[PDB]
Design an enzyme around this catalytic site. Structure first.
Site, PDB file in Angstrom:
ATOM      1  CE  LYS A  11      -4.019  -2.227   2.113  1.00 17.80           C
ATOM      2  NZ  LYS A  11      -5.085  -2.181   3.156  1.00 17.80           N
ATOM      3  CE1 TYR A  51      -9.466  -3.084  -0.757  1.00 14.42           C
ATOM      4  CE2 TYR A  51      -8.793  -1.184  -2.054  1.00 14.42           C
ATOM      5  CZ  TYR A  51      -8.481  -2.230  -1.212  1.00 14.42           C
ATOM      6  OH  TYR A  51      -7.181  -2.424  -0.818  1.00 14.42           O
ATOM      7  CB  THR A  93      -7.303  -5.979   9.342  1.00  7.42           C
ATOM      8  OG1 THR A  93      -7.769  -7.113   8.608  1.00  7.42           O
ATOM      9  CG2 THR A  93      -7.516  -4.700   8.537  1.00  7.42           C
ATOM     10  CG  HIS A 117      -5.344  -6.314  -0.427  1.00  5.41           C
ATOM     11  ND1 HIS A 117      -6.633  -6.232   0.053  1.00  5.41           N
ATOM     12  CD2 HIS A 117      -5.361  -7.290  -1.363  1.00  5.41           C
ATOM     13  CE1 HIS A 117      -7.393  -7.116  -0.565  1.00  5.41           C
ATOM     14  NE2 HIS A 117      -6.649  -7.769  -1.433  1.00  5.41           N
ATOM     15  CD  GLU A 128      -8.591  -9.423  -3.602  1.00  8.13           C
ATOM     16  OE1 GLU A 128      -7.400  -9.750  -3.381  1.00  8.13           O
ATOM     17  OE2 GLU A 128      -9.392  -9.083  -2.705  1.00  8.13           O
TER      18      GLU A 128
END
Length: 138
Positions: A11, A51, A93, A117, A128
């Site tokens: 990220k 998302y 997370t 992620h 994905e």
């Protein structure tokens, strides 16, 4: 118990910290191989489509803004139990809950900027990977 493929995203926060190498190495030293990889900057449209399952979740708006705030590195990881192995190495997370020695424990500052992620299921991994890579590229 099978040779799976899962998606990983490094990220924008991890990129600004310049820990791409340390993070990739965490996967390589733990039985996974990077079999596809590109650095890119997501558009809002890209981030909202990727998302889309969370559009009604309360974290949605903040998630999109963070994920287009800078470039990312997208990768496909391959190895035994790759989906589950990736999640184990990432940790919870939320970094405040992550076990010591995980990526989010080591490199994440907040749940909002939590470094990586990873696909949360084999079904999501399929979509994905296909979102970012044509099948001829794998």
């Amino acid at each position: 118990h099978m040779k799976q493929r899962t998606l990983s995203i490094i990220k924008p926060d991890a990129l600004k910290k310049k820990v791409v190498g340390k993070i990739i190495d965490r996967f390589e030293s733990n039985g996974l191989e990077v079999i596809a990889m590109k650095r890119l900057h997501l558009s809002v449209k890209d981030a909202e489509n990727f998302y889309a399952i969370h559009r009604e979740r309360p974290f949605f708006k903040d998630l999109i803004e963070f994920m287009v705030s800078g470039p990312v590195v997208v990768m496909v990881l391959e190895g035994k139990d790759a989906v589950a192995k990736n999640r184990d190495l990432m940790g919870a997370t939320d970094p405040k809950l992550a076990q010591k020695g995980t990526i989010r424990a080591d490199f994440a500052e907040s749940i909002d900027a939590n470094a990586v992620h990873g696909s949360d299921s084999l079904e999501n991994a399929h979509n994905e990977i296909a979102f970012f890579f044509a099948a001829r590229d794998l």
